[PDB]
Amino acid sequence: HGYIKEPVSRAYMGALEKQTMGWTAAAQKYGSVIDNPQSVEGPKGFPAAGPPDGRIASANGGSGQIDFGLDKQTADHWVKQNIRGGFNTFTWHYTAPHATSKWHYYITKKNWNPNKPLSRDEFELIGTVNHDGSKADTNLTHKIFVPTDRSGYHIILGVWDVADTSNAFYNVIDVNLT
Ligand SMILES: [Cu+]
Numbered sequence: 001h002g003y004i005k006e007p008v009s010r011a012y013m014g015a016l017e018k019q020t021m022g023w024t025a026a027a028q029k030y031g032s033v034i035d036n037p038q039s040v041e042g043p044k045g046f047p048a049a050g051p052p053d054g055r056i057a058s059a060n061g062g063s064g065q066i067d068f069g070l071d072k073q074t075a076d077h078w079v080k081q082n083i084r085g086g087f088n089t090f091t092w093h094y095t096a097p098h099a100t101s102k103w104h105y106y107i108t109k110k111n112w113n114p115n116k117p118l119s120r121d122e123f124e125l126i127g128t129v130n131h132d133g134s135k136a137d138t139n140l141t142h143k144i145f146v147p148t149d150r151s152g153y154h155i156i157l158g159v160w161d162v163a164d165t166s167n168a169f170y171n172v173i174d175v176n177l178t
Contacts (some may be wrong), residue, residue, distance in 0.1 A: 001038040001039055001041070001094065001095045001096040001098075001169070002038050002092050002093055002094035002095060002096070002097065002136065002160065002169060003037045003038050003040070003092065003093055003169070003171055004090055004091065004092055004093075004158050004171045004173060005091055005092065005093040006089070006090070006091045007081055007083060007088070007090065007156070007173050007175065008081060008173070009037070009158070009171040009172065009173050010030075010057065010070060010078060010171070010172050010173065010174055011030075011033050011037040011038075011040050011070065011171055011172075012037045012093075012171075013030075013078070013079050013174075014026060014029075014030035014031075014033045014034040014037060014070075015033075015034055015035075015037040017029065017030065017034070017079075018034040018035070027069075029069075029077075030069050030070065031058075031066065031067040031068065031069015031070060032066050032067045032069065033058075033062070033066045033067075033069060033070060036062075036065060036066060038093075038094075038095045038096075038169075039062045039065040039066055040057075040058065040059045040062050040066065040070070040169055040170050040171055041059055041062050041063045041065060041167050041168070041169050041170075042055075042059030042060050042062065042063060042167070042168060042169075042170055043060075043166055043167065043168065044161045044162065044165075044166055044167055044168035045168075046104070046120075046159050046168060046170070047106075047120045047123070050159075050168065050170075051170060053117065053118070053119035053120060054071060054117035054118065054119070055068070055071055056071075056118045056119075056120075056157070056170060056172070057070040057071050057073070057118055057170070057172045058070040058071045059168075059169070059170040063167070070172070071117060071118070073114065073115065073116060073117055073118055074114065074115050075114040075115055075153065078174040079174060080153060080174045080175060080176040081173075081174070081175060081176065082175070082176050082178075083146065083156075083175045083176070083177060083178075084146075084177075084178055085146055085147060085148035085149075085150075085151075085177060085178055086145065086146060086148055087143055087144070087145055087146075088143070088144060088145075088146050089141050089142065089143055089144075090105065090141065090142045090144055090156075090158055091140055091141040091142075092136065092140060092141075092160065094136050094137050094140075097135045097136040097137035098135065098136060098162045098163070098164070098165070099133050099134065099135060099136075099162065099163040099164050100131040100133070100134070100135065100136040100139075100160065100161065100162065100163055101131055101133060101161045101162070101163040102128060102129060102130050102131055102161050103128070103129040103131070103142060103158065103159060103160050103161070104125065104127070104128045104129070104158075104159045104161070105125070105126050105127045105128075105129075105142070105144045105156060105157065105158050105159070106123035106124060106125050106126060106156070106157040106158075106159070107123065107124060107126050107146060107147060107150075107154055107155070107156050107157075108122055108123060108154045108155045108156075109122055109123070109124055109150075110149065110150045112154075112155075114153055118155070118172070123155075123157055126144060126145060126146065126147060126156075127142070127144040127145060129142045129144075131163070133163045133164075136160065146177070150177060151177045151178050152176065152177060153174070153175070153176060153177075154175050154176075154177050155172050155173065155174055155175070156172070156173040156175055157170065157171070157172050157173070158170075158171045158172075158173065159171075
């Protein structure tokens with residue numbers, strides 16, 4: 001269990017807005033993840049397996065831990081944060097830093113549609129971080145190259161695969177590129 005804390009994942013942004021907008025208004029926007037941003041947990045094996053299209057952002061309800069609120073997708077729904085193309089760091093906060101096989105990061109394609117449910121074929125792999133099966137917190141922060149050939153609203157997906165179970169954690173990040 002854990003989430004991407006910098007940049008702010010959509011799930012963590014939910015937890016943050018619980019504090020500013022209050023429980024009901026935040027949950028109306030994000031669903032029940034606001035209480036448990038660390039629990040966006042689904043099957044591993046992405047992209048050939050894993051959570052189905054339209055259920056990527058919620059990891060198909062976090063294996064029962066959250067609802068499907070994160071799966072909403074419009075151009076205007078989510079809070080974007082600015083990020084510059086090029087090398088960036090992605091830091092996870094772990095409530096339970098399980099043994100880890102890898103992390104893998106994807107970005108939306110130049111021509112993606114921000115008003116449709118997220119699908120695999122809208123993402124491209126941008127970096128993979130191999131791990132030796134030790135705990136996740138032996139490598140908290142990853143340096144990933146974000147493509148420099150696209151701008152505006154994009155989604156970075158980070159995926160954390162657990163070494164010793166069939167699970168992974170899926171955190172989408174809403175960004176305004178350059
Ligand atoms: Cu966990």
